[PDB]
Amino acid sequence: DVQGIRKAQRADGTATVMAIGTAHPPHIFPQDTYADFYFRATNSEHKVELKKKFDRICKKTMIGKRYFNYDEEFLKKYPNITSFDEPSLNDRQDICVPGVPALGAEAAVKAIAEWGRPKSEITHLVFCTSCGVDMPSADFQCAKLLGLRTNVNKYCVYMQGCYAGGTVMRYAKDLAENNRGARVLVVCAELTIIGLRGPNESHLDNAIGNSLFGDGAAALIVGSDPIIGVEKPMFEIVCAKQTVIPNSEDVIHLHMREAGLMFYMSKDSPETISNNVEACLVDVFKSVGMTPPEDWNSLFWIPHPGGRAILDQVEAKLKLRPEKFRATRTVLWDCGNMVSACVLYILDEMRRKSADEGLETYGEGLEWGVLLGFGPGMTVETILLHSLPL
Amino acid sequence: DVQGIRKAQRADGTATVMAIGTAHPPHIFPQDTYADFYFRATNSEHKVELKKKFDRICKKTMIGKRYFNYDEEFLKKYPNITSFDEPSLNDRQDICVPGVPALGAEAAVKAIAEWGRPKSEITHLVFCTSCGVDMPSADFQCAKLLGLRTNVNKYCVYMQGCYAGGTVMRYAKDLAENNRGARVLVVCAELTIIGLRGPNESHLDNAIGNSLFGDGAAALIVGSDPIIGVEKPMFEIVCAKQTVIPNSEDVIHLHMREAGLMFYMSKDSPETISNNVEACLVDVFKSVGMTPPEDWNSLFWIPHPGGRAILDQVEAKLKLRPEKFRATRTVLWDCGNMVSACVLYILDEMRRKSADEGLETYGEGLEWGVLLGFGPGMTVETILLHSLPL
């Protein structure tokens, strides 16, 4: 009986985040001296007017510090990486191919420890990075490092950029919900040395990238039908939808070249996202038969902090009070833009605080919330969350 | 009511393949003259014993011809590509980044035509390639070319190699089954110029790659709950599991370098796969509560044709009759090894032949069958299929 098999195979309830772990590489770079370091490490101190421009840009980021897997001494071994576009992909791959699954595994071990169940109960691995590619891929390496079962179903989410924190939640939803007993380990890990490069005055946008991106890894356990008393259900992934904004392909794009990953951006990302986010929010509510709230302040919020300008304009467009993006701005200050890992860090910050503040739910005491990823396309990932009692 | 939303959101029945379309690039290379073409185009005719070995290998492939998006005249423009390892990734990307989604879209158009419903009813896109990477990624480009709805949920399956034909079936199963009304467009497309390179005597394995791989694209429509009288349900995806074989990481591996994609393989792949496939098959049956058949000839078979030696040894291990891999060997002869597309072509060949012969089911008149992907890791994708009345 094929239908009986299907009925027994699938889960009952909504996919639920039940653990979150994070990990950083060891080297801390304060933002207030980053321009000094960067123009020194790229041998560009003669570009004095460029250097002030970059210092002023760094002061506007609302990033306090970032973590990296390299220090100034390390980079001296790679003059090709600190140039603008000398051949360098091979060296970057030699670092990122083993390094990204290793950092991801550090976050995964912490998520598994919080979860408190044996790693042998992990049935699915969703691994996400925009930093390096290889065959067998980074999911294979992470599973090996962690000792997962040999028949774990793996999903390698490569080169999905800054919306991919939303992407992995979308994957984990269907994996957890369609498979009885499934426990999905989600790992996002980024080592931005894949794209680090020297400044070039004809590509000021490529340079601003070096003011934003930092390293980091985050991991979740997602599953349906939590074991009550044992597992800790925090956020239910009710609806997950990806949207492309037409006529915005030139706003953000990144290309894998002989000089590594080359980042490009127009100035239009704040307005493109803010002019389109409302439609994405209505879509995700209407897709589960719900009416969107009249006041967007009724929800809790995990927007991806792609830039402080993006946050400010989305905040204005949605008429949100200044405290609503508190958790997001805290992670941005503490960590910079860790690409896919950010929104998972922010989910962690929000639920930890909500417990510290003894609130009614993990979502700042509110019932419903939205997690948003933004990135190349332009692409929006919109995740409708229902948070649970604390 | 979160659980009411969940019950309304999910589909009822098993994910079903209901359309298949394929497409090749235009240039046909007969295998019996390939060694001549290859050593001429790579300026390697001084390597006389190398050519003799390579011609002998080409005779053993059981490949009749392959399709490519380039001809001999085209390659004269790229002496870096026809070298062994001069810098060439940028040129390869310039071809593959637009070329792979375009070929994929051509196959998708044929699948959508067979399906017969409006493309606006496609809710998910699973796009798969090992030939080039970009941000926004190939799924974005294919969806754009096709004019899919802007909020299609996309899945970009990059760099999963020769097992990825199974991988995309594994993805499509959970997407279709967890989402009421969802229709999943699956696209596999490969342009092997990402890895084409001249011969070097210290890397005979890499050279053997040029005897196996050819270009191609295949597309599926997968959905649960077929609309009877409108849709054509053919194969139900009952169970889908990925397995890694321990201690076989060096058997097949591919690296993205400044010289493009570098293919490597040991001689151990036929025996590594054959010594482990039974365990994978038992796993997929026991995971849905079924006992495996005492005679493997009771099933129909879609093994990936990674090499004729793999097929021969798997056939022997499972004690299969010589005709059981007929559909696979037909595709290998007509097309070579098209990486992720092969098993989808073979499913098309099997269901077309089964209709031509007026058999009882699309699966050669048998009810249960298995589709197998094999690739780097080593990784096995095991897909348990139930075929439907013809």
Q: Residue A293: which CATH number? A: 3.40.47.10
The one-letter code for the residue type at A343 is V
Q: Write out the H or E segment, with its range, that includes residue B240.
A: strand B235-244
Give me Rg for the CA atoms of chain B. Answer: 21
For residue A145, which residues of chain B lie inside 8 Å, CB to CB? none
Of A290, A181, A169, nearest to A220 by C-alpha is A169
- Compute the distance between CA of residue B334 and CA of residue A120 in angstroms, rounded to an integer: 43
- Compute the distance between CA of residue A198 and CA of residue A43 in angstroms, rounded to an integer: 8
Interface with chain A: mutation pick from B80, B150, B381, highest number of A CBs within 10 Å: B150
Long-range contacts of residues A43-47, Cβ cutoff 8 Å, at least 24 apart: A43/A82, A43/A198, A44/A198, A44/A199, A47/A199, A47/A201
Please check whether residue B188 is in contact with residue B375, taking contact to mean a CB–CB distance below 8 angstroms: no
Residue B378's CB: how many other CB atoms inside 10 A? 25
Backbone φ and ψ of A275, nearest 5°: -75, -10
Please check whether residue A373 is in contact with residue A264, taking contact to mean a CB–CB distance below 8 angstroms: no
Give the dihedral of Cα atoms A200, B141, B130, B112; nearest 10 deg. Answer: 180
Please check whether residue A199 is in contact with residue A42, taking contact to mean a CB–CB distance below 8 angstroms: yes
Of A48, A86, A87, A94, nearest to A70 by C-alpha is A94
**Which token pair is A215?**
């390293």
Give yes or no for B238 touching A (CB within 8 A): yes
Backbone φ and ψ of A209, nearest 5°: -45, -40
- Compute the distance between CA of residue B247 and CA of residue B66 in angstroms, rounded to an integer: 33
Whether residue A335 lies in the annotated active site? no
Instruction: Return all residues near A113 (Cβ < 8 A) that are at least 6 apart.
Output: A21
Give me Rg for the CA atoms of chain A. Answer: 21
- Compute the distance between CA of residue A239 and CA of residue A381 in angstroms, rounded to an integer: 11
Instruction: Return all residues near B154 (Cβ < 8 A) that are at least 6 apart.
Output: A242, B124, B125, B126, B127, B139, B140, B143
Give yes or no for A242 touching B (CB within 8 A): yes
SS3 at position B52: helix
Residue B103's CB: how many other CB atoms inside 10 A? 27
Backbone φ and ψ of B311, nearest 5°: -60, -45
**Which token pair is A226?**
């939590």
Q: Write out the H or E segment, with its range, that includes residue A175.
A: helix A164-177
Give yes or no for B180 touching A (CB within 8 A): no
Minimal CA separation from A130 to chain B, in Å: 9
Domain that holds residue B279: 235-387
Q: Do A243 and B151 touch (CB under 8 A)?
A: yes
The β-bridge relationship of strands A252-257 and A235-244 is unpaired
Give the dihedral of Cα atoms A321, A277, A261, B155; nearest 10 deg. Answer: 130
- Measured between alpha carbons, how far is residue B344 from residues A82, A319, B13, B104, B166 in Å? 44, 50, 22, 13, 9
- Compute the distance between CA of residue B288 and CA of residue A4 in angstroms, rounded to an integer: 10
DSSP string covering B343-388: HHHHHHHHHHHHHHTT-SBTTTT-SEEEEEEEETTTEEEEEEEEE-
The β-bridge relationship of strands A379-387 and A235-244 is antiparallel
Residue B176: is it exposed, middle or buried by C-beta count within 10 angstroms (0-12/13-18/19+)?
Answer: buried
The one-letter code for the residue type at B45 is E
- Compute the distance between CA of residue A142 and CA of residue A186 in angstroms, rounded to an integer: 11
SS3 at position A51: helix
Our CA angle for A23, A174, A154, nearest 5°, is 55
Determination technique used: X-ray
Residue A3's CB: how many other CB atoms inside 10 A? 11
- Measured between alpha carbons, how far is residue A355 from residues A234, A332, A334, A367 in Å? 11, 21, 20, 15
Q: Do A159 and B133 touch (CB under 8 A)?
A: yes
Backbone φ and ψ of B21, nearest 5°: -130, 150
Residue A350: is it exposed, middle or buried by C-beta count within 10 angstroms (0-12/13-18/19+)?
Answer: buried
Dihedral sign, Cα of residue A288, residue A289, residue A294, residue A299: negative
Q: Which residues of B are annotated as a binding site for CoA?
A: 269, 306-309
Interface of B with A in 71-90 (CB under 8 A): 87, 89-90
Instruction: Return all residues near B29 (Cβ < 8 A) that are at least 6 apart.
Output: B37, B65, B66, B67, B68, B214
- Compute the distance between CA of residue B154 and CA of residue A306 in angstroms, rounded to an integer: 21
For residue A95, which residues of chain B lie inside 8 Å, CB to CB? none
Residue B180's CB: how many other CB atoms inside 10 A? 15
Q: Is the preceding omega at residue B378 within 30 degrees of 0, hence cis? A: yes
- Compute the distance between CA of residue B128 and CA of residue B343 in angstroms, rounded to an integer: 13
- Compute the distance between CA of residue B163 and CA of residue B311 in angstroms, rounded to an integer: 14
Q: Is the preceding omega at residue A136 within 30 degrees of 0, hence cis? A: yes
Residue with tokens 């080409």: B58
Residue B287's CB: how many other CB atoms inside 10 A? 17
Please check whether residue A370 is in contact with residue A382, taking contact to mean a CB–CB distance below 8 angstroms: yes
Q: H-type helices in A256-378, by residue range?
A: 269-274, 277-286, 308-317, 326-335, 342-356
Q: Do B243 and A150 touch (CB under 8 A)?
A: yes
Instruction: Return all residues near A94 (Cβ < 8 A) that are at least 6 apart.
Output: none
A306 annotated ligand-binding residue: yes
The β-bridge relationship of strands B16-23 and A235-244 is unpaired
Residue B358: is it exposed, middle or buried by C-beta count within 10 angstroms (0-12/13-18/19+)?
Answer: exposed
Our CA angle for A274, A275, A281, nearest 5°, is 75
**Which token pair is A101?**
């699954």
- Compute the distance between CA of residue A273 and CA of residue B37 in angstroms, rounded to an integer: 51
Chain breaks in chain A (C to N over 2.5 A) after: none
Instruction: Return all residues near B123 (Cβ < 8 A) that are at least 6 apart.
Output: B149, B152, B153, B179, B181, B182, B183, B184
Interface of A with B in 354-383 (CB under 8 A): 375-377, 379
- Compute the distance between CA of residue B3 and CA of residue A200 in angstroms, rounded to an integer: 54
Dihedral sign, Cα of residue A24, residue A340, residue B254, residue B377: positive
3-state SS, B80-148, equals HHHCCCCCCHHHHHHHHHHHHHHHHHHHHHHHHHHHCCCHHHCCEEEEEECCCCEECCHHHHHHHHHCC
Residue with tokens 């596999």: B188
3-state SS, A324-345, equals HHHHHHHHHHHHCECHHHHHHH
3-state SS, A87-153, equals CCHHHHHHHHHHHHHHHHHHHHHHHHHHHCCCHHHCCEEEEEECCCCEECCHHHHHHHHHCCCCCCE
User: Nominal resolution in Å?
Assistant: 1.8
Of A28, A31, A30, A29, nearest to A58 by C-alpha is A31
- Compute the distance between CA of residue B22 and CA of residue B27 in angstroms, rounded to an integer: 16
- Compute the distance between CA of residue A177 and CA of residue A14 in angstroms, rounded to an integer: 6
Residue A227's CB: how many other CB atoms inside 10 A? 11
- Compute the distance between CA of residue B192 and CA of residue A320 in angstroms, rounded to an integer: 50
Please check whether residue A239 is in contact with residue A368, taking contact to mean a CB–CB distance below 8 angstroms: no
Please check whether residue A211 is in contact with residue A34, taking contact to mean a CB–CB distance below 8 angstroms: yes
Please check whether residue A242 is in contact with residue A380, taking contact to mean a CB–CB distance below 8 angstroms: yes
**Strands laid side by side in the A260-265 sheet:** A260-265, A252-257, B134-135
Q: Write out the H or E segment, with its range, that includes residue B53.
A: helix B48-60
- Compute the distance between CA of residue A261 and CA of residue A88 in angstroms, rounded to an integer: 10
Smallest Cβ distance to A2: which of B14, B136, B375?
B14
β-strand partners of A242: A381
Smallest Cβ distance to B13: which of A6, A144, A159?
A6
The one-letter code for the residue type at B224 is S
Q: Write out the H or E segment, with its range, that includes residue B190.
A: strand B183-190
Residue A65's CB: how many other CB atoms inside 10 A? 16
- Compute the distance between CA of residue B9 and CA of residue B179 in angstroms, rounded to an integer: 6
Minimal CA separation from B52 to chain A, in Å: 30
Of B233, B240, B269, nearest to B388 by C-alpha is B233
SS3 at position A379: strand
Of B147, B49, B156, B149, nearest to B97 by C-alpha is B156
Q: Please identify which of the residues B58, B142, B162, B335 carries the catalytic annotation.
A: B162
**Which token pair is A201?**
């005055």
Our CA angle for B126, A153, B17, nearest 5°, is 40
Please check whether residue A283 is in contact with residue A241, taking contact to mean a CB–CB distance below 8 angstroms: yes
Helical axes B326-335 vs B308-317, angle rounded to 10°: 170
Q: Write out the H or E segment, with its range, that includes residue B172.
A: helix B164-177
Please check whether residue B370 is in contact with residue B221, taking contact to mean a CB–CB distance below 8 angstroms: no
Of B63, B23, B17, B31, nearest to B328 by C-alpha is B63
**Strands laid side by side in the B183-190 sheet:** B153-158, B124-129, B183-190, B216-223, B16-23, B235-244, B379-387, B368-375, B300-303
Q: Do B256 and A257 touch (CB under 8 A)?
A: no
**Which token pair is A315?**
């905040």
**Which token pair is A122?**
């992990």
SS3 at position B279: helix
Give yes or no for A158 touching B (CB within 8 A): yes
- Measured between alpha carbons, how far is residue B77 from residues B71, B198, B231 in Å? 11, 15, 46
What is the b/e burial string over B259-281, where b = at least 16 CB atoms within 10 angstroms of the residue's CB? Answer: bbbbbbbeeebbebbbebbeebb
Minimal CA separation from B107 to chain A, in Å: 22
